[PDB]
Scaffold this active site. Structure first.
Site, PDB file in Angstrom:
ATOM      1  N   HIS A   1       0.723  -1.207  -0.115  1.00 13.46           N
ATOM      2  CA  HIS A   1       0.057  -0.020   0.045  1.00 13.46           C
ATOM      3  C   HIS A   1       0.962   1.375   0.095  1.00 13.46           C
ATOM      4  O   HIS A   1       1.985   1.518   0.649  1.00 13.46           O
ATOM      5  CB  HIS A   1      -0.987  -0.171   1.160  1.00 13.46           C
ATOM      6  CG  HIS A   1      -2.093  -1.105   1.249  1.00 13.46           C
ATOM      7  ND1 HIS A   1      -2.995  -1.159   0.570  1.00 13.46           N
ATOM      8  CD2 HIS A   1      -1.961  -2.386   1.745  1.00 13.46           C
ATOM      9  CE1 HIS A   1      -3.854  -2.248   0.667  1.00 13.46           C
ATOM     10  NE2 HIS A   1      -2.947  -3.036   1.606  1.00 13.46           N
TER      11      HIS A   1
ATOM     12  N   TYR B   1      -7.275  38.851  -8.487  1.00 11.16           N
ATOM     13  CA  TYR B   1      -8.122  38.522  -9.442  1.00 11.16           C
ATOM     14  C   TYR B   1      -8.163  39.477 -10.523  1.00 11.16           C
ATOM     15  O   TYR B   1      -8.230  38.701 -11.681  1.00 11.16           O
ATOM     16  CB  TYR B   1      -9.420  38.598  -8.764  1.00 11.16           C
ATOM     17  CG  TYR B   1     -10.606  38.051  -9.227  1.00 11.16           C
ATOM     18  CD1 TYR B   1     -11.348  38.570 -10.537  1.00 11.16           C
ATOM     19  CD2 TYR B   1     -11.125  36.703  -8.976  1.00 11.16           C
ATOM     20  CE1 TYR B   1     -12.623  38.106 -11.016  1.00 11.16           C
ATOM     21  CE2 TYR B   1     -12.184  35.947  -9.526  1.00 11.16           C
ATOM     22  CZ  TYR B   1     -12.999  36.919 -10.691  1.00 11.16           C
ATOM     23  OH  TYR B   1     -13.914  36.096 -11.485  1.00 11.16           O
TER      24      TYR B   1
ATOM     25  N   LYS C   1      -7.703  37.731 -14.171  1.00  8.31           N
ATOM     26  CA  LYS C   1      -8.578  37.788 -15.365  1.00  8.31           C
ATOM     27  C   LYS C   1      -8.052  38.405 -16.468  1.00  8.31           C
ATOM     28  O   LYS C   1      -8.411  37.875 -17.791  1.00  8.31           O
ATOM     29  CB  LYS C   1      -9.668  38.696 -14.819  1.00  8.31           C
ATOM     30  CG  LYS C   1     -11.030  38.719 -15.702  1.00  8.31           C
ATOM     31  CD  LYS C   1     -12.022  39.733 -14.991  1.00  8.31           C
ATOM     32  CE  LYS C   1     -13.333  39.945 -16.079  1.00  8.31           C
ATOM     33  NZ  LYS C   1     -14.187  40.830 -15.433  1.00  8.31           N
TER      34      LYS C   1
HETATM   35  N1  LIG Z   1     -15.755  38.215  -9.194  1.00  9.26           N
HETATM   36  C1  LIG Z   1     -15.258  37.538  -8.598  1.00  9.26           C
HETATM   37  N2  LIG Z   1     -15.595  36.368  -8.399  1.00  9.26           N
HETATM   38  C2  LIG Z   1     -15.241  35.177  -7.483  1.00  9.26           C
HETATM   39  N3  LIG Z   1     -13.949  35.631  -6.892  1.00  9.26           N
HETATM   40  C3  LIG Z   1     -13.774  36.825  -6.773  1.00  9.26           C
HETATM   41  C4  LIG Z   1     -14.052  37.726  -7.678  1.00  9.26           C
HETATM   42  N4  LIG Z   1     -13.322  38.989  -7.447  1.00  9.26           N
HETATM   43  C5  LIG Z   1     -12.315  38.771  -6.604  1.00  9.26           C
HETATM   44  N5  LIG Z   1     -12.455  37.346  -6.047  1.00  9.26           N
HETATM   45  C6  LIG Z   1     -11.494  36.791  -5.187  1.00  9.26           C
HETATM   46  O1  LIG Z   1     -10.964  35.684  -6.100  1.00  9.26           O
HETATM   47  C7  LIG Z   1     -10.753  34.371  -5.511  1.00  9.26           C
HETATM   48  C8  LIG Z   1     -10.583  33.586  -6.644  1.00  9.26           C
HETATM   49  O2  LIG Z   1     -11.820  32.508  -6.552  1.00  9.26           O
HETATM   50  P1  LIG Z   1     -11.950  31.451  -8.028  1.00  9.26           P
HETATM   51  O3  LIG Z   1     -12.970  32.061  -8.968  1.00  9.26           O
HETATM   52  O4  LIG Z   1     -10.615  31.032  -8.308  1.00  9.26           O
HETATM   53  O5  LIG Z   1     -12.382  30.321  -7.268  1.00  9.26           O
HETATM   54  C9  LIG Z   1     -13.336  30.446  -5.949  1.00  9.26           C
HETATM   55  C10 LIG Z   1     -12.790  29.413  -4.824  1.00  9.26           C
HETATM   56  F1  LIG Z   1     -12.507  27.897  -5.426  1.00  9.26           F
HETATM   57  C11 LIG Z   1     -14.013  29.514  -4.000  1.00  9.26           C
HETATM   58  C12 LIG Z   1     -13.783  30.391  -2.927  1.00  9.26           C
HETATM   59  O6  LIG Z   1     -12.734  31.537  -3.411  1.00  9.26           O
HETATM   60  P2  LIG Z   1     -12.723  32.828  -2.481  1.00  9.26           P
HETATM   61  O7  LIG Z   1     -11.944  32.615  -1.106  1.00  9.26           O
HETATM   62  O8  LIG Z   1     -13.859  33.563  -2.696  1.00  9.26           O
HETATM   63  O9  LIG Z   1     -11.541  33.738  -3.265  1.00  9.26           O
HETATM   64  C13 LIG Z   1     -11.880  34.350  -4.529  1.00  9.26           C
HETATM   65  C14 LIG Z   1     -12.112  35.604  -4.204  1.00  9.26           C
HETATM   66  F2  LIG Z   1     -11.619  36.135  -2.988  1.00  9.26           F
HETATM   67  C15 LIG Z   1     -15.169  29.699  -4.861  1.00  9.26           C
HETATM   68  C16 LIG Z   1     -14.773  29.665  -6.438  1.00  9.26           C
HETATM   69  N6  LIG Z   1     -15.745  30.249  -7.389  1.00  9.26           N
HETATM   70  C17 LIG Z   1     -15.822  31.772  -7.375  1.00  9.26           C
HETATM   71  N7  LIG Z   1     -16.549  32.074  -8.623  1.00  9.26           N
HETATM   72  C18 LIG Z   1     -16.792  30.655  -9.140  1.00  9.26           C
HETATM   73  C19 LIG Z   1     -17.392  30.509 -10.564  1.00  9.26           C
HETATM   74  O10 LIG Z   1     -17.885  31.219 -11.274  1.00  9.26           O
HETATM   75  N8  LIG Z   1     -17.265  29.065 -10.747  1.00  9.26           N
HETATM   76  C20 LIG Z   1     -16.485  28.093  -9.870  1.00  9.26           C
HETATM   77  N9  LIG Z   1     -16.019  28.498  -8.686  1.00  9.26           N
HETATM   78  C21 LIG Z   1     -16.074  29.623  -8.396  1.00  9.26           C
HETATM   79  N1  LIG Z   2      -6.058  -5.136  -0.580  1.00 12.46           N
HETATM   80  C1  LIG Z   2      -7.265  -4.208  -0.498  1.00 12.46           C
HETATM   81  N2  LIG Z   2      -7.165  -3.074  -0.376  1.00 12.46           N
HETATM   82  C2  LIG Z   2      -7.919  -2.143  -0.518  1.00 12.46           C
HETATM   83  N3  LIG Z   2      -9.337  -2.137  -0.977  1.00 12.46           N
HETATM   84  C3  LIG Z   2      -9.387  -3.609  -1.363  1.00 12.46           C
HETATM   85  C4  LIG Z   2      -8.715  -4.700  -1.090  1.00 12.46           C
HETATM   86  N4  LIG Z   2      -9.332  -5.823  -1.481  1.00 12.46           N
HETATM   87  C5  LIG Z   2     -10.391  -5.388  -1.637  1.00 12.46           C
HETATM   88  N5  LIG Z   2     -10.623  -4.205  -1.595  1.00 12.46           N
HETATM   89  C6  LIG Z   2     -11.848  -3.340  -2.012  1.00 12.46           C
HETATM   90  O1  LIG Z   2     -11.362  -2.536  -3.204  1.00 12.46           O
HETATM   91  C7  LIG Z   2     -11.843  -1.197  -3.056  1.00 12.46           C
HETATM   92  C8  LIG Z   2     -11.133  -0.162  -4.054  1.00 12.46           C
HETATM   93  O2  LIG Z   2     -10.111   0.568  -3.038  1.00 12.46           O
HETATM   94  P1  LIG Z   2      -8.865   1.496  -3.947  1.00 12.46           P
HETATM   95  O3  LIG Z   2      -7.710   0.843  -3.447  1.00 12.46           O
HETATM   96  O4  LIG Z   2      -9.456   1.666  -5.210  1.00 12.46           O
HETATM   97  O5  LIG Z   2      -9.112   2.770  -3.043  1.00 12.46           O
HETATM   98  C9  LIG Z   2      -9.881   3.185  -1.820  1.00 12.46           C
HETATM   99  C10 LIG Z   2     -11.046   3.923  -1.864  1.00 12.46           C
HETATM  100  F1  LIG Z   2     -10.521   5.196  -2.503  1.00 12.46           F
HETATM  101  C11 LIG Z   2     -11.213   4.206  -0.333  1.00 12.46           C
HETATM  102  C12 LIG Z   2     -12.388   3.424   0.350  1.00 12.46           C
HETATM  103  O6  LIG Z   2     -12.406   2.145  -0.801  1.00 12.46           O
HETATM  104  P2  LIG Z   2     -13.357   0.784  -0.229  1.00 12.46           P
HETATM  105  O7  LIG Z   2     -14.837   1.344   0.010  1.00 12.46           O
HETATM  106  O8  LIG Z   2     -12.608   0.307   1.031  1.00 12.46           O
HETATM  107  O9  LIG Z   2     -13.289  -0.141  -1.410  1.00 12.46           O
HETATM  108  C13 LIG Z   2     -12.269  -0.806  -1.700  1.00 12.46           C
HETATM  109  C14 LIG Z   2     -12.163  -2.257  -0.960  1.00 12.46           C
HETATM  110  F2  LIG Z   2     -13.718  -2.553  -0.753  1.00 12.46           F
HETATM  111  C15 LIG Z   2      -9.498   3.921   0.356  1.00 12.46           C
HETATM  112  C16 LIG Z   2      -8.854   3.959  -0.992  1.00 12.46           C
HETATM  113  N6  LIG Z   2      -7.572   2.885  -0.513  1.00 12.46           N
HETATM  114  C17 LIG Z   2      -7.330   1.662  -0.376  1.00 12.46           C
HETATM  115  N7  LIG Z   2      -6.118   1.191  -0.200  1.00 12.46           N
HETATM  116  C18 LIG Z   2      -5.305   2.402  -0.758  1.00 12.46           C
HETATM  117  C19 LIG Z   2      -3.998   2.553  -0.779  1.00 12.46           C
HETATM  118  O10 LIG Z   2      -2.943   1.718  -0.660  1.00 12.46           O
HETATM  119  N8  LIG Z   2      -3.732   3.909  -1.370  1.00 12.46           N
HETATM  120  C20 LIG Z   2      -4.569   5.084  -1.441  1.00 12.46           C
HETATM  121  N9  LIG Z   2      -5.958   4.597  -1.220  1.00 12.46           N
HETATM  122  C21 LIG Z   2      -6.203   3.431  -0.907  1.00 12.46           C
END
Ligand SMILES: Nc1ncnc2c1ncn2[C@@H]1O[C@@H]2COP(=O)(O)O[C@@H]3[C@H](F)[C@@H](COP(=O)(O)O[C@H]2[C@H]1F)C[C@H]3n1cnc2c(=O)[nH]cnc21
Ligand SMILES: Nc1ncnc2c1ncn2[C@@H]1O[C@@H]2COP(=O)(O)O[C@@H]3[C@H](F)[C@@H](COP(=O)(O)O[C@H]2[C@H]1F)C[C@H]3n1cnc2c(=O)[nH]cnc21
Lengths: 193, 193
Positions: free
Chosen positions: B16, B137, B141
């Site tokens: 793992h 921002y 932009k």
């Molecule tokens: N006009 C403006 N609009 C938005 N933010 C603005 C604006 N002016 C300044 N800012 C600042 O800029 C950063 C970068 O935000 P960014 O857009 O990268 O993504 C942000 C973050 F992942 C999360 C919180 O971020 P927050 O802490 O608010 O910081 C912001 C803010 F401080 C929400 C996510 N989000 C915002 N809008 C959309 C969208 O349309 N689609 C999908 N996701 C969106």
């Molecule tokens: N030997 C086995 N080990 C693990 N799972 C096993 C095994 N045999 C059968 N299974 C089943 O198979 C699926 C696919 O799990 P997968 O590995 O895709 O990823 C899983 C999921 F994202 C999350 C819960 O998943 P869960 O609901 O438990 O389902 C499992 C389980 F039911 C944890 C994540 N995770 C597990 N191991 C690692 C790792 O080493 N690194 C990073 N992430 C890891």
């Protein structure tokens, strides 16, 4: 505050972009527990979300969104209000009786689609993924073992896996090798067309 | 249960894989509120995480991990136990008095590094990102407006942005155009070497 539906040609690249919506405002929809549609109140579901996307002008806009439970049939564009009477979104996607609340939500994927593809899958609980496929863990392990020796090429396809306990995104090259994986640790559903 | 440190050559592709660790078990470390190191108890920090990665055999292993607060100086490899006395991890990364707890954690990024690069940044609160840069921002932009006309090429570089309120990953082509963005809605810090 204006909200235009992508399904009806409303995409505007100079407005805020969310799954299904171009809007003049950017509302953080994570904070709501109750919303209103046509003067009826609906509760937001706790700890389970909806993975929603729109694809417009070769741009993918995807995110995990809150959803509310509503036994009425609602339609794209129906205005969604807060309890203070302000419009905060519009109806966009549904999964049976769950309706997405689109806005600034949880984990997101934005992507330029030119040159690549993207596909969405329901992830079966307990299954594993490699590349473009899901299956039982031991089956997937055998696949990964075969692909381990290949040299990684450029990403050509994205696969979105939406499960009850985890969501993930994988990417593959033209030979099916997995190049990159991101995991989102939240449970969700996909919309039903 | 065995835990081998990547910093000391411990990577094993048949075990793992977690940031800094190859282990014979896969512990879900999200559930702990208190851990023990050399028979001293430490509290896990609530609602703030540490973005940690190791890079071994051209493989990137990155994730948001819980961290505990500890005024003692701890070193890579120090065993971390649960309160029942079972070893659950080893010390890997620190940020001042915060120590990562590596295992199955929150949002993650796994990546084949051959052919690409990856870079990590502290995201200043309130700043925006485009591609490989952060800034105010309105500056960002203007940059995005210039790059809008370019046709997207293949991803060549990844940029990880770790902020107090949000984390994100962007990718660019050789011309600096942003190809894909993922957002993780959690706040975190980066390790200090
Ligand atoms: N006009 C403006 N609009 C938005 N933010 C603005 C604006 N002016 C300044 N800012 C600042 O800029 C950063 C970068 O935000 P960014 O857009 O990268 O993504 C942000 C973050 F992942 C999360 C919180 O971020 P927050 O802490 O608010 O910081 C912001 C803010 F401080 C929400 C996510 N989000 C915002 N809008 C959309 C969208 O349309 N689609 C999908 N996701 C969106
Ligand atoms: N030997 C086995 N080990 C693990 N799972 C096993 C095994 N045999 C059968 N299974 C089943 O198979 C699926 C696919 O799990 P997968 O590995 O895709 O990823 C899983 C999921 F994202 C999350 C819960 O998943 P869960 O609901 O438990 O389902 C499992 C389980 F039911 C944890 C994540 N995770 C597990 N191991 C690692 C790792 O080493 N690194 C990073 N992430 C890891």
């Amino acid at each position: 505050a204006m909200f235009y539906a992508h399904a009806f040609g409303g995409y505007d690249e100079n407005l805020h972009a969310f799954p299904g919506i171009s809007s003049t405002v950017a509302n953080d929809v994570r904070k709501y527990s109750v919303v209103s549609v046509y003067n009826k109140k609906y509760n937001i579901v706790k700890n389970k979300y909806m993975w929603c996307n729109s694809q417009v002008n070769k741009r993918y806009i995807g995110a995990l969104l809150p959803m509310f439970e509503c036994n009425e049939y609602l339609q794209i564009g129906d205005p969604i209000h807060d309890l203070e009477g302000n419009q905060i979104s519009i109806v966009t996607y549904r999964h049976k009786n769950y309706y997405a609340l689109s806005g600034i939500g949880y984990e997101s994927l934005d992507l330029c689609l030119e040159g690549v593809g993207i596909h969405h899958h329901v992830l079966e609980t307990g299954n594993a993924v490699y590349g473009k496929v899901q299956h039982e863990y031991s089956t997937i392990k055998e696949k990964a073992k075969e692909m381990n020796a290949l040299k990684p090429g450029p990403i050509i396809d994205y696969h979105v896996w939406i499960g009850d306990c985890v969501c993930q995104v994988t990417t593959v090259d033209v030979h099916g090798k997995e190049i990159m994986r991101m995991r989102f640790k939240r449970g969700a559903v996909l919309p039903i067309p």
